[PDB]
Every structure is written in C-alpha cells, then in structure tokens.
Design a protein around this ligand. Structure first.
Ligand SMILES: [Zn+2]
Ligand SMILES: [Zn+2]
Ligand SMILES: [Zn+2]
Ligand SMILES: [Zn+2]
Ligand SMILES: [Zn+2]
Length: 267
C-alpha cells in the first residue's frame, strides 16, 4: 500500500514518545469546538478527541500530508448525533504543524434528520512553538521553502522570505493545478499578537491585482519555520439576466515552509 510507513494507526493509538521526531504533539482547538467530539479513523484504528486534546504527530511523516477519515459529533441527552464527515488532513513540520477539513457530507437544512452531500475545504488549527516577537533575529534575511495545499491538491510549492532588519516578509505560491491559486504573497509587516507571537498578515496578488489575504506565524526558537493559510477570492457575474448580480467565492490554501540546511564548515 502507498500509505505503508505513514504511521496513521500509530498516531491514533500510541501515547507521546519523546524519542519521536517533532513536532511531537498538535493541540486540537479550532479543529473541535468545546462540547463536540471529533472521531478520526485510519488503517483499522479509531480515536475520539475533544477541545484541548492533542494528536500524536510524532508518529507521522515530516513534510507530507497525512490523511484520516473524520466524523464530527455532538452528544445530546444520550443521543450521539453526526454534524459532518469527510477527510481530515495533517501537515507536519519540526516546530509547527497544521490541519484541514475536506467535507464530503453535512447536516441537511432542507430535509431535517438527513445528511446531504456537500464538498467544501477549510483550515483547522495552526499549531506549534510560536517565536516571540520580542526575541526575533535582529537582522539578516531567511528564505523558507515548503508546501501549499488546497482541495484535492497537495502539490503546490511555497517560497517565502523574511527580512528581519525591516521586519517584513513576502513570497509566492506555484504549481497548484488551478492557475488563479498561484498567487503572490505581498510584502507585509511582522507584528506581535495578544500572546506576543510573531505574526504576518497581508494581501495576496494575481497579475498585480488584490485577490484576497494571507496570515503566517513564525515558529521555532530560531525562526526556523512559517505556517498559516491564504484565502483567494473570485467574483462571479451573471450573463443571462438583465439584473447584473454577483456572487463571491473563497478558496482556502494551507501553508507551511522551513529554512533548508546550508552547506557549512566547523572551522
Ligand atoms: Zn512527556
Ligand atoms: Zn522546536
Ligand atoms: Zn475568511
Ligand atoms: Zn565546503
Ligand atoms: Zn555541521
């Protein structure tokens, strides 16, 4: 099987082992609200999570997308109810990781009691060892290389550069199947968030026009990694009505990159 060596069942069944390659644990917060249940399943194993529980990413492969079946549930006075089902994706780095949901079924709002087929893709948690804004490198520049992944497309390539003297970053997404998702990530400032985490929020561009927004956290004690997401907006227009109406579509992209080791001497 092509998933041999993926460690999916191991992730669902083993306790934390401090000998495993990091990131060892991914705390679930955005991925499962308080009071709900998230059931994951793969390779014959299953485990249910609540808000604050951690996934054992130490058992998964670095720099790849790991895939699990999921069922989102709530228990209401004795009855276990399905809210949503589909594929749960996890992308692991050494100091950071992220999750995402490919929905396939949701609760039906036109015929109550039923599940209905519906495809949608969203980002879950962005997790890891946040770099403090107040302890960043004081100068120089670093280049990060990694992955951009969206709905049915884990092949995108992320390049991103941070100038620590200017406290600014910029980069680009290449090689996604859908051409309008290969956007530039415009120059944007590093700022501290409410927990002093170093975070970058800016615009995305396509042939020089503004087409949405992105956010990246910086991770690791020495700013080794970036992780976060982008949102690409597309406007759709009527062609067959006298009334000119629009509809806006949003497509989400998960983002993760790392600095590469460079050839060096010890003398
Ligand atoms: Zn421990
Ligand atoms: Zn670390
Ligand atoms: Zn949004
Ligand atoms: Zn040399
Ligand atoms: Zn060395």
């Amino acid at each position: 099987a092509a998933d041999i060596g993926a460690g999916l069942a191991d992730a669902l069944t083993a306790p934390l082992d401090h000998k495993d390659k990091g990131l060892q644990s991914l705390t679930l917060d955005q991925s499962v609200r308080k009071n709900e249940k998230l059931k994951l399943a793969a390779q014959g194993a299953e485990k249910t999570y609540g808000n604050g529980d951690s996934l054992n990413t130490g058992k998964l492969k670095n720099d790849k997308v790991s895939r699990f079946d999921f069922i989102r549930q709530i228990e209401v006075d004795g009855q276990l109810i399905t809210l949503e089902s589909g594929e749960f994706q996890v992308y692991k780095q050494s100091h950071s990781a992220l999750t995402a949901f490919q929905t396939e079924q949701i609760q039906d709002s036109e015929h109550s009691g039923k599940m209905v087929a519906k495809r949608q893709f969203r980002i879950g948690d962005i997790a890891g060892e946040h770099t403090s804004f107040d302890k960043l490198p004081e100068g120089g520049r670093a280049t990060y290389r990694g992955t951009a992944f969206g709905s049915d497309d884990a092949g995108g390539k992320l390049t991103y550069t941070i100038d620590f003297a200017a406290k600014q970053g910029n980069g680009k997404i290449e090689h996604l199947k859908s051409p309008e998702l290969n956007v530039d990530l415009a120059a944007a400032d590093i700022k501290p968030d409410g927990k002093r985490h170093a975070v970058i929020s800016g615009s995305v561009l396509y042939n020089q026009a503004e087409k949405g927004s992105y956010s990246l956290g910086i991770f690791g004690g020495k700013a080794q990694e970036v992780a976060g997401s982008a949102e690409v907006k597309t406007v759709y227009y009527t062609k067959d009505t006298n009334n000119n109406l629009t509809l806006v579509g949003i497509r989400h992209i998960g983002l993760a990159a790392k600095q590469l080791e460079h050839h060096h001497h010890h003398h």
